[PDB]
Design a protein around this ligand. Structure first.
Ligand code: BCL
Ligand code: BCL
Ligand code: BCL
Ligand code: BCL
Ligand code: BCL
Ligand code: BCL
Ligand code: BCL
Ligand code: G2O
Ligand SMILES: CCCCCCCCCCCCCCCCCC(=O)OC[C@H](CO[C@@H]1O[C@H](CO)[C@H](O)[C@H](O)[C@H]1O)OC(=O)CCCCCCCCCCCCCCCCC
Ligand code: SF4
Ligand code: SF4
Ligand SMILES: [Ca+2]
Lengths: 100, 110, 645, 364
C-alpha cells in the first residue's frame, strides 16, 4: 500500500501546472503526478478519481495563478478554491522568493 | 573448412520547496554549497509544532540540483519544476501497484 | 557521504573483492593464531621459561589439550614437548596464513595468474581442480549465490575430511564411535563430510531459490548469513556451556582448575621502598614476579568456559543485530529503488502489508511488556521482602515459584533464579526484537510516518527535525543502536547467570536478615555468588586485587562516560562550543604566532555521534564484563544457614 | 550429470470443489508464484479481474455478465467495466445488449453495444460424434455483427472519429489493415500461433447521430473469426455459456501482479460449467480450452523452470474418481489430491504451452 507509489502521499499527488487563461479559458489545465513522467488533462474521469479520494490535485503558488478567480473565487484564507464548487480543494503555498 | 579471425575474451530548473509540506529539517542547507546560501530558515511559531520552514532564494540559487538529486527530503516538499512544467517530488517514485495478498491453500501459509 | 567506515562497504566491492578480503582475513587470523600458540609456550624448547598465560591462550588451551598438543603436565620434559608442538603448529599456521594472504591479495587485485603456468584464471568460469572439478561439477557456479551453495558445501565436506585426516595422521586420533572420548570428533568429521558432500551435490544439481539475495547479494545475502550465523553462534555458546559442564569434557576442563597459572598483570610480590638486590614480601619468589593464582579458588575451568560461552553469545547477538541492520539497509535501498514492491518472496511479501507489521510488532510489544512486568515485579517484590520494607518477610517472596517439574530437567538446582533468568532472557529477546522488527518493517515509513507525511530517505540520517516535537533516532542505524542498548540487558543477564548470581533478587547476601535467609528457605545446594547489586561488591574484590583488572575497569569506565557526551542531545551545544574554541585558538593570534591557524575544531555528526556513542557504550560495558568473567567463579557448594535459628 | 542448470522455480496450488448431483457447478481457487521475469515491455503490470454474472429472468434468458478489469501498467491506471445481457437465441446464434466504459489514466469513454454472433461449425457429421468419445478439435467460424455506439463527449473521441471517418473512405485496404491495428502487441503473432484466423471486417456504415446526451458515433461492423480447431470460442460453443446452469449468481476475483522479479496470480471463482457429462454414466472435469494453453506457450518458453504444483479436487460424496492420468498422489475418502511426479511433468508441459490431457473422470 504505502510502499507502492510515493510513500509520502496517501492519494496520488497531482500538482497543477500554470496552464491557464490564455485561450478561451484553457480548459486543458495541466495535471502532473508526483512521478511527473506523464502530463494529463482534467477530464471528467480524473474528476471521478479526485472525488473518489484515490488522487488529489493541488495548486502551486510560485507561478502565474491558475484561473485563480475563474475556477473559484472563495478567498477566505486565499486557499478555498474548488473545481465543482463542492470539492474541498487544497492549495500548496510557496512564498519562496518574496520572503526574506 | 575456412573461417575468419575472431577475438572473444568473455569465456574462461528553478527549484521550489512547499512550506505546507516542509517540516524544517534543513538537509537542503547541508546539501547547498556555503558560497551560495540559498536555503534559509523562516520562523513562524513554536518550534515543536513545526515552526520554521525553509526557503530558496531564486536569484541566489543557480541550478546546482544537489538538493533534489540527493533525494534527502522526507516530506516531499523539495519540488523541481521543468521547462515544460512537470513537477517532481522525488527523482524516481516507486510505481503504484495493485496490492492483493497471496495465500496458498495447501501450503503452510493459508 | 562516503566516510572511513564506508570505504570497505560491500556496495563498492565485487564477489572477487570479498573473496580476497575473506582470504586476507583468514591469513591474518592464522598469523594471530600463531601469535597465540607462541604465547602458550610455557617452557621454551631452547631450555628457558615461556609466556605468562595470556587470556587468549588460556581460552585456546583446553581445545589444544583435546588434540595431541598442550599436555596438562607439570613435568618439564612433557611441557617442553607441549611447547615444541605449539611452536611447530604455530609455524605451520604462519606459513598457511602467508599463502592465504597472498591469495587474498591476488583476488583483491583481480590478478589471477599462475606463476608456473602463464594462464589467467577467470573468476566467473573455471574448474575447481584439475580432475576433481570435472568429476563433480564439470564447471563453475554461474555467478549466482544460490548456485554456489552446492560447491561451498562440497568444499566444507572436503575440509571436514581433511580435518579427519589431520586428526588421523598428525594428531594421532583414530576414529572410533565412542562419543564420550575425544577420538570420535574425527569420526563425526568424516560423517559430516559424507553428509555435506551429499547436501552439496544435491544443491549443485538442484539450487535452492530465494531470489531476493541474488540481485544485491552484497547486502541481502550478507544480512541473511550474518543473522543465521549469529543464531548459530548463540547455539554454539549454549552447546559449549552445556558440554564444558559435562563429565566427558572434564579431563580437558576440570584439570584446568587443578593447575595454577601465572597471568600477565596478576599481582606480583611487592618489594619495599628499600630492596637491596645486590625487604621483599613473599621472598621465595623473585622481585616483581607474579604470585601464582590457584585455579581451585579462581575456578579457572568455569572462567574459561564463561569467556568462551559469552564471547560466542555476544558475537552471535551482535551478528544478529548487524544482520537485521544490514537487511534494513537493503530494504531501504529497494524501497527507495522501487524494488520493494517487486521482490516476490514470502520473506518480504508478508511484511509488505503495513497492518501485518503493526500486528507483529504489537504482539511482540505485548509479550515483552507482559513478561517484563511479571519478571520485574517478581524481582522487586523479592527485593522488598528480603529487605523487609513495608513489613514483608521472604515468606511473601517468590521462593515457591520454581520452574515446572516437566521443565526442570535443564537446570542444576531448580529455583526462582532460573525462572527469572529464563523470563529475563525471553523479555530481553523480545525487547531487542521490538527494535529489530522496527528495522525490518519500518526502514522507509512507519505507520506514524505514513499518517504524518514523512519518509526515511537514508540509512544514516540523523532525524527529521523538531517537527511534532520529536523525530529523533528514527533511522535504522539509530534503531540498531537502541536494539544493542536493549540487548545489553539480556547479555548482562547471560553473563551474570553463567558467572553465578541471584538474578531473582537485587541484594542477596547483604548483612540484612532475609537476604541471608534466602538460601535457608530455598533449599539450594548451590550458593550463588550474590544478588544483582551485591554482585559488584562480591566480585570486585579480585578486580581490585588485580592491578590489571583495575586498569581495565578504569579504561572501560572512561570510555562509557565519554560515550555519554555524544549520546545526549547536545550536538548543537558542542558545535557552538567548538566555534568558541576555534575563535580563541584564532586568538592565539596576537600571541606572537604569525601563523594562520586553519584548524576548525571538529564535532561529530549526529549519525556519527550515535555511532561513536554506541561503540563506546558497548565497549566500556563489555570491557568491564570481561572483568566480571575474569574475577573468578567463586561459587561454593555450601548452603547458607539462617541468621537466626 | 544433469543438464540445464540455473532454473527458476514456480509454486502453484489449485483447488476444484465440485458439486454433486445434476449440478455441474465448481469452485476453483488457484494460486501461483513464479520467479521468472514477465514478458511485459512495460513490466510493472498488476491487473485485477472481477467477472460477476447474474441470472436474469430465464423466460427469454439474457444472463447478465459484469466484467471489471483494473490494470496498473507502468504506473498507468486503466479500468474497463462492461455489463451486458447475453442470450443464446438458438444453439448457433447469440444476441447480446450491453454497456461498458474504458478509462485509461485520464481518458474515459462509455459505449453501448448490441451484437449478433452466429457460430457455425464447418461440418456436423453424425459419424464423427459416433466414432469419437470427445472431439476437442472442431473446425468452425464465428460471424460477429457488432453495433457499438460511443458518445463523443471528449475531444479525443471527436478527433479519432473524424480520423476513422476519413480512413474508411480514403482507403479500401483499411478493412485489411484494421486487423494490423486490431492486435495491439504480439497478439498478431498469437493469432497464427493459436490457429485463429481473422477475416477482413466488412463495415456496414459508421455514422454519427446527434444525441441529447452528447453526440454519438454509431459504428456497425461485421467480422469473421475462423478457427483451425483449437479455438475454444468456436469449437466449444455448446460450452462457454451456462445457458441453463445459472440458477445461482457466479463470480470470479482473479488477478495477477507482475514485476521484474516475478509473477503473482490469485484466482477465486465459481463456475457453472466445470463438469461435463460423458458416456457410460461418467462425468469429467471439462477439457482444457487450448487457446489459453497455446497463448500462454509464447511466454512460457522464455525461461527454464521447475514447478511445485498441488491440486485438490474436492469431489462430492456421491462420486468416486476414475481414469485419472496422471494418477492421484493422496487419496482422501472424498477429496483427491494430485501432486508431483507425472502431474508436475504435466504442469511443466502446459506452462510452456503443451496441449496435453489431464483426464479426470468422476462417476457414481
Ligand atoms: C562468520 C563469518 C561471517 C563473516 C565475517 C566477517 C568478518 C569477521 C570480517 C568480514 C569482512 C568482510 N566481509 Mg564478511 N562475513 C560473512 C558474510 C559475508 C558476505 C555474504 C555471505 O554475503 C559478504 C558479501 C561479506 C563481505 C565482507 C566484506 C564487507 C569484508 C571483506 C572484503 C574486503 O576486502 O574488506 C575490506 C577490508 C578488510 C578485509 C579488512 C579491514 C581491516 C579490519 C580487519 C576490519 C575489521 C572490522 C571488525 C573489527 C571485524 C570484527 C568482528 C567482531 C570482533 C565480532 N561477508 C559470514 C557470514 N566478514 C571483514 C570486514 O572488513 O569487515 C568490515 C571482517 O572484519
Ligand atoms: C591460498 C589458497 C587460496 C587461493 C589462491 C590462489 C592463487 C595463488 C592462485 C589462484 C588461482 C585461481 N583462483 Mg584461487 N585461492 C583460493 C580459493 C579460490 C576460490 C574459491 C574456492 O572460493 C575461487 C573462486 C578461486 C578462484 C581462482 C581461479 C579463477 C584461479 C585458478 C583457475 C583454475 O582453473 O585453477 C584450477 C584450480 C583452482 C580453481 C584452485 C582453487 C583453490 C585451491 C583450493 C587452492 C589453490 C592454491 C594452493 C596453494 C595449491 C594447493 C591446493 C590444495 C591441493 C587443495 N580461488 C584459496 C583458498 N588462487 C590461480 C590462477 O589464477 O591460476 C591460473 C593462482 O595462481
Ligand atoms: C582458517 C584460517 C587460519 C587458521 C585459524 C585457526 C583458528 C581461528 C582456529 C584454529 C585452530 C586449529 N587449527 Mg588453524 N588456521 C589455518 C590453517 C590451518 C590448517 C591448514 C592446513 O589450513 C590446519 C590443519 C590447521 C590446524 C588447526 C588445529 C591445530 C586447530 C583445530 C582445528 C579443528 O578443530 O578444526 C575443526 C574442523 C572442522 C569443524 C571441519 C572443517 C571446517 C568446516 C567445513 C566449516 C564448518 C565448521 C566451522 C569451523 C564451525 C562452525 C560450526 C557451525 C555449527 C556451522 N590450521 C588458517 C591459516 N586455526 C583452532 C584452535 O586453535 O582451537 C583452540 C581454531 O579455533
Ligand atoms: C529463518 C532463517 C533466518 C532468516 C532468513 C531470511 C531471509 C531468507 C530473508 C530475510 C530477510 C529479512 N530478515 Mg531474516 N532470518 C532470520 C532471522 C531474522 C530475525 C530474527 C531476530 O529472528 C530478524 C528480525 C530478521 C530480519 C530480517 C528483515 C531485515 C528481512 C525481512 C523483512 C520482512 O518483511 O519480513 C517479513 C516477515 C516474515 C516473512 C516472518 C515470517 C518468517 C517465515 C517466512 C514464516 C514461518 C516462520 C514462523 C512465523 C515462525 C515459527 C516457525 C519457525 C521455524 C521458528 N531476520 C533467520 C536467522 N531473513 C530478507 C531480506 O530482505 O534480507 C535482506 C530475506 O531475504
Ligand atoms: C517461465 C515460464 C513461467 C511463466 C512466465 C510468464 C511470462 C514470461 C509471462 C507470463 C504471463 C502470465 N502468466 Mg505465466 N508463467 C508460468 C506459469 C504460470 C502459472 C502457473 C504456475 O500455473 C500461471 C497461473 C500463469 C499465469 C499467467 C498470467 C497471470 C499472465 C497472462 C495473463 C493473461 O491471461 O492475459 C490475457 C491476455 C489477453 C486475453 C490478450 C489481450 C490483448 C488482445 C489484443 C485481445 C485479445 C482478445 C480480447 C480479449 C477479446 C475481447 C472480447 C471478447 C468478447 C471476449 N503462468 C511459467 C512457470 N507468465 C504473462 C503476463 O501477463 O505477464 C505480465 C507474461 O508475460
Ligand atoms: C476472444 C475470442 C474471440 C471472440 C469470441 C466471442 C465469444 C465466445 C462470445 C463473444 C461475444 C461478444 N463479442 Mg467477441 N470475440 C473476439 C473478439 C471481439 C472483439 C474485439 C477484440 O474487437 C469485439 C469488440 C467483440 C465483440 C463481442 C460482442 C458483440 C459480444 C458480447 C461482448 C460482451 O458481452 O462482452 C462482455 C465482456 C466480458 C465478460 C469480458 C471477459 C471475456 C472473457 C473471454 C470471459 C472469460 C470467462 C471466464 C473463463 C469464466 C467466467 C465465470 C464468471 C463467473 C462470469 N468480440 C475474438 C475474435 N465473442 C459473445 C456473444 O456472442 O455475444 C452475442 C460470446 O458469446
Ligand atoms: C464474452 C465472453 C464469452 C465467454 C468466453 C469464454 C471462453 C473463450 C472460455 C470460457 C470458459 C468458461 N466460461 Mg465463458 N463466456 C461467456 C459466457 C459465460 C458465462 C455467462 C453466463 O455470462 C459464464 C458464467 C461462463 C462460464 C465459463 C465456464 C463454462 C468456462 C470455464 C470453466 C473453468 O473451469 O473455468 C476455470 C477458469 C478460471 C479459473 C480462469 C479465469 C481467468 C480469467 C478471469 C478469465 C479469462 C479471460 C482472460 C484470461 C483474462 C481477461 C482478459 C481481457 C481483460 C478480457 N461463460 C461470454 C459470452 N468462456 C473457458 C472454457 O473452458 O471454455 C470451455 C474458455 O476458455
Ligand atoms: C574525560 C571525559 C570528558 C572530556 C575529556 C571532555 C572534553 C570537552 N568537552 Mg565534554 N562531556 C562529558 C565528558 C568529557 N568531556 C560527558 C560525560 C558529557 C555529558 C553531559 C559531556 C557533554 C558536553 C557538552 C554538551 C559540551 C562539551 C564540551 C567539551 C570541551 C570544550 C572545552 C572545555 O570544556 O574544556 C574542559 C575539558 C577538558 C580539560 C577535557 C580534556 C582533558 C580532560 C580533563 C580529561 C582527558 C580525557 C581524555 C581526553 C580521554 C582519552 C585520552 C586519550 C585515549 C585520547 C572539552 C574539552 C563543549 C564545548 O566545546 O565547550 C565546553 C560542549 O558544548 N561536553
Ligand atoms: C527461551 C529462552 C531461553 C531460556 C533462557 C536460558 C535459561 C536456560 C538455563 O537456565 O540453562 C541453565 C544453564 C546454567 O545452569 C545452571 O546455571 C547455574 C547459574 O549459576 C550454574 O551455573 C549451574 O552450574 C548451571 O547448571 O544455563 C545455560 O546453559 C547458559 C547458556 C546461556 C543461554 C542464553 C543464551 C541466549 C542469549 C540471549 C541474549 C539476549 C539478548 C537480548
Ligand atoms: S540548487 Fe544549488 S544553489 Fe539552489 S539550493 Fe540547491 S545547492 Fe543551493
Ligand atoms: S529536506 Fe525536505 S523537509 Fe528537510 S528542509 Fe529540505 S524541503 Fe524541508
Ligand atoms: Ca564473576
Amino acid at each position: 500500500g504505502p510502499w507502492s507509489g510515493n510513500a509520502v502521499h496517501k492519494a496520488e499527488k497531482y500538482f497543477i501546472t500554470s496552464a491557464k487563461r490564455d485561450r478561451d479559458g484553457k480548459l486543458q489545465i495541466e495535471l502532473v503526478p508526483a512521478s511527473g513522467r506523464r502530463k494529463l488533462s482534467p477530464t471528467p474521469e480524473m474528476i471521478r478519481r479526485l472525488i473518489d479520494g484515490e488522487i488529489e490535485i493541488y495548486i502551486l503558488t510560485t507561478q502565474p495563478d491558475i484561473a485563480i478567480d475563474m475556477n473559484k473565487e472563495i478567498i477566505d484564507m486565499e486557499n478555498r478554491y474548488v473545481i465543482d464548487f463542492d470539492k474541498r480543494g487544497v492549495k500548496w503555498t510557496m512564498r519562496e522568493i518574496p520572503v526574506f | 573448412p575456412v573461417e575468419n579471425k575472431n577475438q572473444a575474451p568473455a569465456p574462461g530548473k528553478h527549484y521550489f520547496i512547499i512550506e505546507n509540506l516542509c517540516v524544517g529539517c534543513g538537509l537542503c542547507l547541508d546539501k547547498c554549497p556555503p558560497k551560495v546560501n540559498a536555503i534559509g530558515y523562516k520562523f513562524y511559531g513554536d518550534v515543536q509544532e513545526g515552526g520554521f520552514r525553509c526557503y530558496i532564494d531564486q536569484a541566489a540559487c543557480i541550478s546546482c540540483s544537489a538538493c533534489f538529486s540527493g533525494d534527502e527530503c522526507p516530506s516531499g516538499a523539495l519540488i523541481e519544476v521543468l521547462p515544460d512544467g512537470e513537477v517532481l517530488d522525488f527523482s524516481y517514485t516507486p510505481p503504484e501497484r495493485l496490492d492483493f495478498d497471496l495465500r496458498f491453500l495447501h501450503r503452510f501459509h493459508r | 557521504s562516503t566516510k572511513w567506515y564506508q570505504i570497505f562497504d560491500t556496495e563498492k566491492l565485487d564477489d572477487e573483492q570479498v573473496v580476497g578480503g575473506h582470504l586476507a582475513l583468514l591469513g591474518v587470523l592464522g598469523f594471530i593464531m600463531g601469535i597465540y600458540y607462541i604465547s602458550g609456550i610455557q617452557v621454551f624448547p631452547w631450555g628457558a621459561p615461556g609466556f605468562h598465560d595470556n587470556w587468549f591462550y588460556l581460552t585456546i588451551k583446553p581445545r589444544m589439550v583435546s588434540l595431541g598438543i598442550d599436555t596438562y603436565s607439570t613435568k618439564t620434559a612433557d611441557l617442553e614437548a607441549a611447547g615444541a608442538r605449539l611452536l611447530g603448529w604455530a609455524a605451520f599456521h604462519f606459513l598457511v596464513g602467508s599463502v592465504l594472504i597472498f591469495g587474498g591479495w591476488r583476488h583483491w587485485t583481480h590478478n589471477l595468474t599462475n606463476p608456473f603456468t602463464g594462464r589467467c584464471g577467470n573468476f566467473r568460469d573455471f574448474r575447481f581442480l584439475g580432475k576433481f572439478g570435472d568429476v563433480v561439477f564439470n564447471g563453475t557456479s554461474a555467478k549466482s549465490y544460490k548456485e554456489a551453495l552446492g560447491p561451498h558445501a562440497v568444499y566444507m565436506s572436503l575440509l571436514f575430511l581433511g580435518w579427519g585426516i589431520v586428526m588421523w595422521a598428525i594428531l594421532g586420533f583414530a576414529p572410533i564411535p565412542d562419543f564420550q572420548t575425544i577420538n570420535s570428533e574425527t569420526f563425526m568429521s568424516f560423517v559430516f563430510a559424507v553428509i555435506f558432500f551429499a547436501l552439496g551435490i544435491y544443491w549443485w544439481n538442484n539450487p535452492p531459490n530465494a531470489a531476493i539475495h541474488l540481485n544485491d547479494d552484497m547486502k541481502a545475502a550478507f544480512s541473511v548469513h550474518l543473522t543465521a550465523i549469529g543464531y548459530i553462534n548463540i547455539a554454539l555458546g549454549c552447546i559449549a556451556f552445556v558440554a564444558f559442564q559435562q563429565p566427558s569434557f572434564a579431563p580437558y576442563y576440570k584439570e584446568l582448575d587443578k593447575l595454577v597459572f601465572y597471568l600477565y598483570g596478576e599481582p606480583f610480590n611487592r618489594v619495599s621502598f628499600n630492596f637491596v638486590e645486590q625487604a621483599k614480601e613473599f621472598a621465595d619468589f623473585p622481585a616483581y614476579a607474579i604470585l601464582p593464582k590457584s585455579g581451585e579458588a579462581f575456578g579457572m575451568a568455569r572462567v574459561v568456559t564463561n569467556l568462551i560461552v559469552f564471547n560466542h553469545i555476544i558475537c552471535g547477538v551482535l551478528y544478529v543485530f548487524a544482520g537485521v541492520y544490514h537487511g534494513g539497509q537493503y530494504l531501504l535501498k529497494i524501497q527507495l529503488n522501487g524494488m520493494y514492491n517487486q521482490i516476490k518472496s514470502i520473506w518480504i511479501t508478508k511484511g509488505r502489508d503495513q497492518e501485518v507489521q503493526v500486528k507483529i510488532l504489537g504482539t511482540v510489544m505485548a509479550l515483552c511488556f507482559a513478561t517484563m512486568l511479571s519478571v520485574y515485579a517478581v524481582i522487586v517484590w523479592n527485593t522488598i521482602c528480603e529487605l523487609n520494607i513495608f513489613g514483608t518477610n521472604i515468606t511473601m517472596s517468590f521462593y515457591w515459584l520454581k520452574p515446572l517439574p516437566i521443565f526442570q530437567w535443564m537446570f542444576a538446582d531448580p529455583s526462582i533464579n532460573d525462572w527469572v533468568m529464563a523470563h529475563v532472557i525471553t523479555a530481553g529477546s523480545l525487547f531487542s526484537l521490538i527494535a529489530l522488527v522496527r528495522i525490518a518493517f519500518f526502514a522507509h515509513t512507519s505507520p506514524l510516518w505514513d499518517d504524518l507525511g514523512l519518509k526515511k530517505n537514508s540509512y544514516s540520517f540523523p532525524c527529521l527535525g523538531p517537527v511534532y516535537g520529536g523525530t529523533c533516532g528514527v533511522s535504522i542505524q539509530d534503531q540498531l543502536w537502541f536494539a544493542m542498548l536493549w540487548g545489553i540487558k539480556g547479555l548482562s543477564a547471560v553473563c551474570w547467570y553463567i558467572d553465578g548470581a541471584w538474578i531473582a533478587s537485587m541484594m542477596y547476601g547483604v548483612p540484612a536478615a532475609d537476604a541471608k535467609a534466602w538460601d535457608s528457605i530455598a533449599h539450594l545446594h548451590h550458593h550463588y555468588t550474590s544478588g544483582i547489586f551485591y554482585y559488584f561488591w562480591t566480585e570486585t574484590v579480585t578486580i581490585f586485587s588485580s592491578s590489571h583488572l583495575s586498569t581495565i575497569l578504569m579504561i572501560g569506565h572512561l570510555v562509557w562516560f565519554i560515550s555519554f557526551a555524544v549520546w545526549f542531545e547536545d550536538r548543537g551545544s558542542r558545535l557552538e562550543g567548538a566555534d568558541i574554541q576555534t575563535r580563541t585558538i584564532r586568538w592565539l593570534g596576537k600571541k606572537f604566532l604569525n601563523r594562520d591557524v586553519n584548524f576548525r575544531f571538529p564535532v561529530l555528526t549526529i549519525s556519527d555521534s550515535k555511532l561513536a556513542g554506541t561503540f563506546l557504550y558497548f565497549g566500556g560495558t563489555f570491557m568491564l564484563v570481561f572483568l566480571f568473567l575474569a574475577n573468578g567463579f567463586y561459587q561454593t557448594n555450601s548452603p547458607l544457614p539462617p541468621p537466626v535459628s | 550429470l544433469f543438464g540445464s542448470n540455473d532454473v527458476t522455480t514456480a509454486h502453484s496450488d489449485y483447488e476444484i470443489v465440485l458439486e454433486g448431483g445434476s449440478s455441474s457447478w465448481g469452485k476453483v481457487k488457484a494460486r501461483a508464484k513464479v520467479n521468472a521475469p514477465p514478458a511485459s515491455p512495460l513490466l510493472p503490470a498488476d491487473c485485477d479481474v472481477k467477472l460477476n454474472v447474474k441470472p436474469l429472468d430465464p423466460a427469454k434468458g439474457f444472463v447478465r455478465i459484469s466484467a471489471v478489469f483494473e490494470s496498473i501498467v507502468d504506473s498507468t491506471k486503466n479500468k474497463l467495466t462492461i455489463e451486458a445481457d447475453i442470450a443464446n437465441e438458438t444453439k448457433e446464434r447469440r444476441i447480446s445488449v450491453g454497456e461498458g466504459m474504458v478509462s485509461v489514466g485520464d481518458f474515459s469513454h462509455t459505449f453501448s453495444f448490441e451484437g449478433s454472433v452466429v457460430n457455425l461449425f464447418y461440418y456436423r457429421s453424425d459419424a464423427v460424434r459416433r466414432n469419437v468419445p470427445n472431439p476437442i478439435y472442431m473446425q468452425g467460424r464465428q460471424f460477429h455483427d457488432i453495433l457499438m455506439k460511443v458518445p463523443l463527449d471528449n475531444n479525443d473521441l471527436i478527433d479519432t472519429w473524424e480520423g476513422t471517418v476519413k480512413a474508411i473512405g480514403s482507403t479500401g485496404a483499411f478493412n485489411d489493415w484494421i486487423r494490423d491495428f486490431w492486435f495491439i502487441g504480439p497478439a498478431f503473432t498469437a493469432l497464427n500461433e493459436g490457429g485463429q484466423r481473422i477475416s477482413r471486417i466488412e463495415v456496414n456504415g459508421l455514422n454519427t447521430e446527434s444525441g441529447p446526451k452528447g453526440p454519438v458515433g454509431v459504428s456497425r461492423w461485421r467480422f469473421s473469426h475462423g478457427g483451425s480447431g483449437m479455438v475454444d470460442s468456436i469449437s466449444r460453443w455448446a460450452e462457454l455459456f451456462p445457458s441453463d446452469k445459472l440458477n445461482r449468481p457466479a463470480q470470479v476475483e482473479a488477478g495477477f501482479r507482475s514485476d521484474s522479479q516475478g509473477i503473482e496470480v490469485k484466482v477465486d471463482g465459481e463456475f457453472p460449467g466445470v463438469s461435463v457429462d460423458a458416456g457410460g454414466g461418467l462425468r469429467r472435469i471439462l477439457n482444457h480450452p487450448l487457446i489459453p494453453l497455446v497463448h500462454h506457450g509464447m511466454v512460457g518458453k522464455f525461461n527454464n523452470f521447475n514447478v511445485d504444483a498441488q491440486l485438490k479436487v474436492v469431489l462430492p460424496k456421491g462420486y468416486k474418481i476414475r481414469y485419472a492420468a496422471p494418477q492421484y498422489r493422496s487419496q482422501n475418502l472424498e477429496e483427491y489430491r494430485w501432486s508431483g511426479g507425472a502431474y508436475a511433468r504435466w504442469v511443466e508441459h502446459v506452462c510452456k504451452g503443451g496441449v496435453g490431457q489431464f483426464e479426470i473422470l468422476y462417476a457414481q
